[PDB]
Amino acid sequence: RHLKSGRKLNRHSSHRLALYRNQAKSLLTHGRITTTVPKAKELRGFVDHLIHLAKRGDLHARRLVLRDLQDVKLVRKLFDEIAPRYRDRQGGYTRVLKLAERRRGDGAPLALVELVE
Amino acid sequence: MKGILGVKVGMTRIFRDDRAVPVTVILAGPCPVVQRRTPEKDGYTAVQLGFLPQNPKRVNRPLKGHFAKAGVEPVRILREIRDFNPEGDTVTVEIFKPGERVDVTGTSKGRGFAGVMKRWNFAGGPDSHGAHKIHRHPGSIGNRKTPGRVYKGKKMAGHYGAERVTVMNLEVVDVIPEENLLLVKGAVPGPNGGLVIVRETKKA
Amino acid sequence: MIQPQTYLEVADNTGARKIMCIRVLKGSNAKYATVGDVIVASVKEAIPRGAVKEGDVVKAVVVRTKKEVKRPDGSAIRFDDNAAVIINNQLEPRGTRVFGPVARELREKGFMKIVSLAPEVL
Amino acid sequence: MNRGALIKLVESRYVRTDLPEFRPGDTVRVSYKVKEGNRTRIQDFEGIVIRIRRNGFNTTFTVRKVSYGVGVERIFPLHSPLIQKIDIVQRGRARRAKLYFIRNLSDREIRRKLRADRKRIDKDRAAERAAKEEVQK
Amino acid sequence: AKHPVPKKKTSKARRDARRSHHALTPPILVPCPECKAMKPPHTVCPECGYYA
RNA sequence: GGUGAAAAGAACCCCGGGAGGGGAGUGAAAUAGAGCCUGAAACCGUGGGCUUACAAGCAGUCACGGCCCCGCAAGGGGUUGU
RNA sequence: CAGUGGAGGCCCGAACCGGUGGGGGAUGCAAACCCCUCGGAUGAGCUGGGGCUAGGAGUGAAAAGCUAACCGAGCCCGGAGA
RNA sequence: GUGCAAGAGCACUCAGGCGCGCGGGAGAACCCUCGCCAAGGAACUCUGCAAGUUGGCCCCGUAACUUCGGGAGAAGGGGUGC
RNA sequence: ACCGGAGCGCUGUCUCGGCGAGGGACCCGGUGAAAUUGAACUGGCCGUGAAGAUGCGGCCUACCCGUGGCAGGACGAAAAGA
RNA sequence: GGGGAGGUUUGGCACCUCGAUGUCGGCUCGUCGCAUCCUGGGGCUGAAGAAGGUCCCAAGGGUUGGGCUGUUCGCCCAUUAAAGCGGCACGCGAGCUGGGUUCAGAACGUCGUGAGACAGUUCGGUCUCUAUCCGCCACGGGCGCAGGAGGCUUGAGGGGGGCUCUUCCUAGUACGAGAGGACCGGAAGGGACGCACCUCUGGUUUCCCAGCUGUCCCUCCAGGGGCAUAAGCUGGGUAGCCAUGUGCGGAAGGGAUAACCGCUGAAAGCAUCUAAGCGGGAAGCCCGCCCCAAGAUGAGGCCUCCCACGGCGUCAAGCCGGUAAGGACCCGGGAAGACUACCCGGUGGAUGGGCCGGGGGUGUAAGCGCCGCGAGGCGUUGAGCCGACCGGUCCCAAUCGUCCGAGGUCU
Numbered sequence A: 001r002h003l004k005s006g007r008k009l010n011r012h013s014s015h016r017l018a019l020y021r022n023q024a025k026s027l028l029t030h031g032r033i034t035t036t037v038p039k040a041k042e043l044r045g046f047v048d049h050l051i052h053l054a055k056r057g058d059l060h061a062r063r064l065v066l067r068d069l070q071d072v073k074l075v076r077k078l079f080d081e082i083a084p085r086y087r088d089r090q091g092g093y094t095r096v097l098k099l100a101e102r103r104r105g106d107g108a109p110l111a112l113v114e115l116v117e
Numbered sequence B: 001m002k003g004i005l006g007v008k009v010g011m012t013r014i015f016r017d018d019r020a021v022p023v024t025v026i027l028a029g030p031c032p033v034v035q036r037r038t039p040e041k042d043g044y045t046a047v048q049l050g051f052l053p054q055n056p057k058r059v060n061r062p063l064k065g066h067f068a069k070a071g072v073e074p075v076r077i078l079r080e081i082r083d084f085n086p087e088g089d090t091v092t093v094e095i096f097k098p099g100e101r102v103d104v105t106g107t108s109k110g111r112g113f114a115g116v117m118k119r120w121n122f123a124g125g126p127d128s129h130g131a132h133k134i135h136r137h138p139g140s141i142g143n144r145k146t147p148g149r150v151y152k153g154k155k156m157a158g159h160y161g162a163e164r165v166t167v168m169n170l171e172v173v174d175v176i177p178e179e180n181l182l183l184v185k186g187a188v189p190g191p192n193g194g195l196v197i198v199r200e201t202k203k204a
Numbered sequence C: 001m002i003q004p005q006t007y008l009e010v011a012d013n014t015g016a017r018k019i020m021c022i023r024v025l026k027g028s029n030a031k032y033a034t035v036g037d038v039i040v041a042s043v044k045e046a047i048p049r050g051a052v053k054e055g056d057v058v059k060a061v062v063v064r065t066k067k068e069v070k071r072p073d074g075s076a077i078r079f080d081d082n083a084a085v086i087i088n089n090q091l092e093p094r095g096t097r098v099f100g101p102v103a104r105e106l107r108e109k110g111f112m113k114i115v116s117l118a119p120e121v122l
Numbered sequence D: 001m002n003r004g005a006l007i008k009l010v011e012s013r014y015v016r017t018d019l020p021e022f023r024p025g026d027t028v029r030v031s032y033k034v035k036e037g038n039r040t041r042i043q044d045f046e047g048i049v050i051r052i053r054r055n056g057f058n059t060t061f062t063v064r065k066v067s068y069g070v071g072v073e074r075i076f077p078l079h080s081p082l083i084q085k086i087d088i089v090q091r092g093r094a095r096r097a098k099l100y101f102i103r104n105l106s107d108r109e110i111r112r113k114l115r116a117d118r119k120r121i122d123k124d125r126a127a128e129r130a131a132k133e134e135v136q137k
Numbered sequence E: 001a002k003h004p005v006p007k008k009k010t011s012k013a014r015r016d017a018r019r020s021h022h023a024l025t026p027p028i029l030v031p032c033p034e035c036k037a038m039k040p041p042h043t044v045c046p047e048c049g050y051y052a
Numbered sequence F: 001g002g003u004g005a006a007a008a009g010a011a012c013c014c015c016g017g018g019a020g021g022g023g024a025g026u027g028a029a030a031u032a033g034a035g036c037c038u039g040a041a042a043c044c045g046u047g048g049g050c051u052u053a054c055a056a057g058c059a060g061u062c063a064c065g066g067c068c069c070c071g072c073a074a075g076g077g078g079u080u081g082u
Numbered sequence G: 001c002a003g004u005g006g007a008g009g010c011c012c013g014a015a016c017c018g019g020u021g022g023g024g025g026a027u028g029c030a031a032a033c034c035c036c037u038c039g040g041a042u043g044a045g046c047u048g049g050g051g052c053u054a055g056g057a058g059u060g061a062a063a064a065g066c067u068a069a070c071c072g073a074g075c076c077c078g079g080a081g082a
Numbered sequence H: 001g002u003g004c005a006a007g008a009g010c011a012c013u014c015a016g017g018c019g020c021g022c023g024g025g026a027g028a029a030c031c032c033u034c035g036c037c038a039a040g041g042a043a044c045u046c047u048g049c050a051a052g053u054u055g056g057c058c059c060c061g062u063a064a065c066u067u068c069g070g071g072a073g074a075a076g077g078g079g080u081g082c
Numbered sequence I: 001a002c003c004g005g006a007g008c009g010c011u012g013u014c015u016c017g018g019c020g021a022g023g024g025a026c027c028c029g030g031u032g033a034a035a036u037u038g039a040a041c042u043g044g045c046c047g048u049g050a051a052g053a054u055g056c057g058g059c060c061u062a063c064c065c066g067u068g069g070c071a072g073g074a075c076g077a078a079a080a081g082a
Numbered sequence J: 001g002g003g004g005a006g007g008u009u010u011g012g013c014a015c016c017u018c019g020a021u022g023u024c025g026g027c028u029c030g031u032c033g034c035a036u037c038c039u040g041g042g043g044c045u046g047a048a049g050a051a052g053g054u055c056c057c058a059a060g061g062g063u064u065g066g067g068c069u070g071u072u073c074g075c076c077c078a079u080u081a082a083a084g085c086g087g088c089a090c091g092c093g094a095g096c097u098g099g100g101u102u103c104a105g106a107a108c109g110u111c112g113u114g115a116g117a118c119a120g121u122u123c124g125g126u127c128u129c130u131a132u133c134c135g136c137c138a139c140g141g142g143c144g145c146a147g148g149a150g151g152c153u154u155g156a157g158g159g160g161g162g163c164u165c166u167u168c169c170u171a172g173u174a175c176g177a178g179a180g181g182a183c184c185g186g187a188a189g190g191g192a193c194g195c196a197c198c199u200c201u202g203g204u205u206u207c208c209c210a211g212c213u214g215u216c217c218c219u220c221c222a223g224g225g226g227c228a229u230a231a232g233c234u235g236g237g238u239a240g241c242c243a244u245g246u247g248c249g250g251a252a253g254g255g256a257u258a259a260c261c262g263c264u265g266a267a268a269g270c271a272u273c274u275a276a277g278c279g280g281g282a283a284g285c286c287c288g289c290c291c292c293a294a295g296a297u298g299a300g301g302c303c304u305c306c307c308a309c310g311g312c313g314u315c316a317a318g319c320c321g322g323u324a325a326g327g328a329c330c331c332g333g334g335a336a337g338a339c340u341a342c343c344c345g346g347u348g349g350a351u352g353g354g355c356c357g358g359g360g361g362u363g364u365a366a367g368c369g370c371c372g373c374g375a376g377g378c379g380u381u382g383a384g385c386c387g388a389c390c391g392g393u394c395c396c397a398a399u400c401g402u403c404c405g406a407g408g409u410c411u
Helices: A013-030 A037-054 A059-065 A072-086 B063-070 C104-108 C112-117 D006-011 D101-105 D120-136 E012-018
Strands: B003-016 B019-027 B031-037 B046-051 B077-082 B101-107 B164-171 B181-183 B195-200 C019-024 C038-043 C057-062 C076-079 C084-088 D027-032 D043-048 D051-053 D060-062 D072-077 D088-090
Touching: A013 A037, A013 A072, A037 A059, A037 A072, A059 A072, B003 B046, B003 B077, B003 B181, B003 D006, B019 D006, B031 B063, B077 B195, B181 D006, C019 C057, C038 C084, C104 C112, D027 D072, D043 D072
Parallel strands: none
Antiparallel strands: B003 B019, B003 B195, B019 B181, B031 B046, B046 B077, B101 B164, B101 B195, C019 C038, C038 C057, C057 C084, C076 D072, D027 D043, D027 D088, D051 D060, D060 D072
16 A cells, blocks of 8 residues: 655656656646646645746855756746845745636546746 | 553653663543542443643534533543552553553554555565566465355455554563653554553453 | 484584584474574584584584674674584583684573583683 | 644654764664573674665665675664664765665675765864864863 | 457346446536636636636 | 438527537427337336335235225225234 | 698578567557567578459468458459349 | 677767656665675585676787587787776 | 476465555446246255155244345256256 | 175266266365364273273364376375375366377387277377356445434354464383383473564565666767666665564363263162262363354344424325425545545544655766876765655645435324
8 A cells, every 4th residue: 555655746766757747847837837736736845946946046055946947947937036036035935726627538637827926 | 450541752762781671651640530430330340541631722612511520620531441440539650651662552553544555464476577566466365166255354455554453562661751752662652642542451 | 403404513522524404303393493402413514533423413502603692681692603512412512622612592491512612702 | 633744743752853964875884782582682793884774764775785605684773772783884886766776786896886975074073073163162 | 359258248237236336426516706607626617717 | 221202411599618509490290309200028127006124935815904996876906014 | 641722501699581488469559569588590591663364363481371350262343132 | 880800789968758656754673686805715515506706899829539510719928098 | 398306595375474565346427238038935954755845845034125245056047958 | 604784996777968067187265074183081901100992972173295197096205193084976177287098190019901999008189268047256326124313232142263283391210120200280392374563684666775788869078868668787675565583372261061080879678870859070062252143024232412393284094395404515634445434534624735854765866076198086965856654834735515314103
């Protein structure tokens, strides 16, 4: 019997690892994102790390966040806009509002991933 | 028939004189005698201990009359030690001198819908030379025509864990009145943060 | 943890230089053995004109092992090899000068000469 | 109740202090309490530390030597009332937490894989003999 | 086809019997403050929105 | 193989992207609406009456009772509890 | 003897040709498959194209194998409603 | 195209072309495929079936027997990177 | 890639199993088969009967309806016994 | 020489089954029988003691690992308290194997001119993904339990468990010429199996940390990412799940007994364990232990909370909207789990996510500076990285709300 631990996912190791990244990239571009409750709830955590990481400055943190996302120009958008707006706010750099419309032809539940303002 | 409730905080080990005593930790934070049972009007004897304080928010239930009847701060849980009548107050850990042996019940780790190999330490099959569709299979279950049924309770694949269990004759190793903790011998069912009753032992 | 088939050494000037286990004397059907436990075993090699010959079905006590014993004091101990000293049925060690580390356990099991003679009971 | 951990540290009073620091990869001996019949010893166990695994209480290092031709590995809880001394005997540059590998080349191959942290030694001879002057005069 | 197969056509009464809990429980909804419209509980839905 | 006496093969409106229906209209007949005369049985459904959750079965059948139903009345049917 | 020399139903190993062992597959992806391993791999090699040989007949490094997915005698029609 | 003694090998990758025409989640047993393992090391079992060890190159070195070709990659062992 | 005996190496073959990964299984949405099927309102035992009974007899236990699993029975399916 | 019993053996008869009832042996899973292999209890003895022989009681439990063999069997080896026997379609192929055997190839001895044949041998040879019903192991939904609720319980009735070795004291005492060597009671260890546990030991730990090759890539150096498996590879690993690892249990004791040992005592002036009465006596039976359990339709009990009609039905049970206790919905989640159920929690909130501290794991990041032609090395450094575990923090997320649910029959 499994799960006595704590975590979720569907996909293999290196897929899901990319998944979170191809979501981060979108999240950190469109600001609002609308996938499935699970992915969403997972995106949640992931980016929160980076954001909180970008709330720090030194070039090391940058390279460390630049390790997930890849566009060196996106990371600029992070340390040159986002995080600066998250000072005086410790943690909770995201929000996951669940929409009430499912996808047609797989009855998938949906939601939102918002950079909290 | 002494008896006190608690939880399973966690377990490590100590050193008695110079030998190592692997201990587990139980918690008998003062327990309120909530109701008793006189054969006079119950059919037997037993004292129901309550446990773990509680804001009168989830207590909104009619249990509040029940506590207010027994002048008892509104707890969260309560069960019956058999024939354990102390005195008009409440039971600490002062009940168990260090050294005394205790019987310890508790609910086991739920191991989901487990396999035969797991449930009943069955044998299943050979990882090897044939079949490769039975390696954790039960095997045969019955006989040919006669009987033609299967024995009620033939060890098969089901749920393993989440059942009431007791473990007995345990050496209470130390008792911490100062902060209500109970040292035992280590092997005690249930996970951490787990509810468990403890009572004097069956030795004589 | 030595079990029936396992290759032990010979912590002594007995004659054998390597024996396989044959049966664990312990219970009527114990799974294994450990330092201080006895086993019937077979000699799979021996120095020429040794007191013991090859093929000799011997009784040997374990001195060392590759699976750590647990000391009631929470400690442990494990050697780099499974070893044995061969013994006259009275459980008296057959070699003269034994050699090779051994386990404190033996001292509680009637086997003085093994550890008396032994260099370093550890 | 809010402190599932601090409850066992309430137990924690069976914990030592005087014992020196000794990260894994340096030769250290440890005088050990044993029973030779009905008396008590101080068995000098001197060897290289092969693995420390931590847990506040019940945390164990494991030493390793080569007693008379053959090699051994005793275990030692870091808080066992059965350890009189524990004079380390030479710091060592380790470069890895659990050094099991030394099993298959304990010899004149080891003497080139664990030189010595000429770094921690500095601290020692300094702190030691320098704390003396603050305890003497 | 292979090994296990039905030994008997399933009596309609037993088929319609196995259906017992087929029925689907209609979606749970509640009016919302924003509009007089219907929403599922804990869901952001059109003709409305929210607050931050 | 089959509408119909005749295409008179359903204008227009309505919902619907369509399919498809609802009114209006044609026709003696549209439950003759187009694979459409007749429309059987299996089989699938919706509403109603009776009936079932301590009960053991080739399912029917005697016997009585309750309920529901046509009938002045006596009676007849449907169901089925024992 | 050394050098050169570059023979071989020689050697390792792709393509290609096989199908040994095991696992899967068994209303299969498949009326013969999938994976791991394995055999030959300049020869009695493999293969495209154009051609000839067939029913008691052919072909056959021989199993009674093959001859249009069941060959101790093909398939279709026919005597035949044996 | 680059790297490995070489290569149509392998790994990654050009130009090019695809993600295999059901998706969503949950992370029970059980099956497949797969990775690891304490101590033992064929006790398994009809059988080391399977799996595992070994592997490339260069070097040292190589038994019986022999048709004097072979046995030979016998066996065992060292080196490899920067 | 014949069949047999043993020895070294090495191993989940085994003692003895454990944990982990992925594809199914499982839950939701779309799609939606199959052999089989006298009819079923299909329990246990000891009998009994064409001699191996849910269906006869006596006795016993059984509230109705299912979902995931096991494969003992329905002399289960399959093929008018090789 | 006689009489049986059983229905495990070899047969006999040919009754069901040839529009199919898959045969040997093993693995798995067993269950039952007693005619008992062991352990417990007895009678006798050609029983000193110890040991053993035989009969009796007794299934509760246990009944080993290998060598050979297709084997069942048996032989052997090392043990053991013992290494029991049989039933169950020679239990078990819709559970597995396929060595054996009964296919087509092939050969050997062999009979046969022969084609072929052989309870003679030898090599090889295709065991079918999908369970309707019963039975079974698990989990639910509906209804029930004559007010409706929340919580705690009684245990009818079931199940589980049940084993057993060695050693020291009593004592080297009774015993015996000695060797040998006890009853009895007492004490400490061990095997195997069971249950639970993760503290230690020890495994996994799938992207927790680092190391490495090749490659392509961002961005040229440093720094990094993809891929090499669905982890590229190697070293290492908390939580969790785990066994080799840790704790526990098999009892004690009460009662009724088996064989058996006995008190009193006739029938029958004695005697008799018996026909009246009574007592002692097994690991077995009944409690005891653990778990299941009021669908215990015979539906229990205990404490506490809510409490008339608000409208149609005159008479009758009913019927309708709102309500009380409270329950449910939904959402957030759990060492709960397939689903469902179960459990905590839901802004009065720490419920996950985040953030921080601690734990723990990796083992001195990046950058910069110093040294070396250089690969590197040294420091700043136990640094940087840092899932699960232990706590805190309302930053994000369980906001708002809907439905349901008493009106309490009769004697």
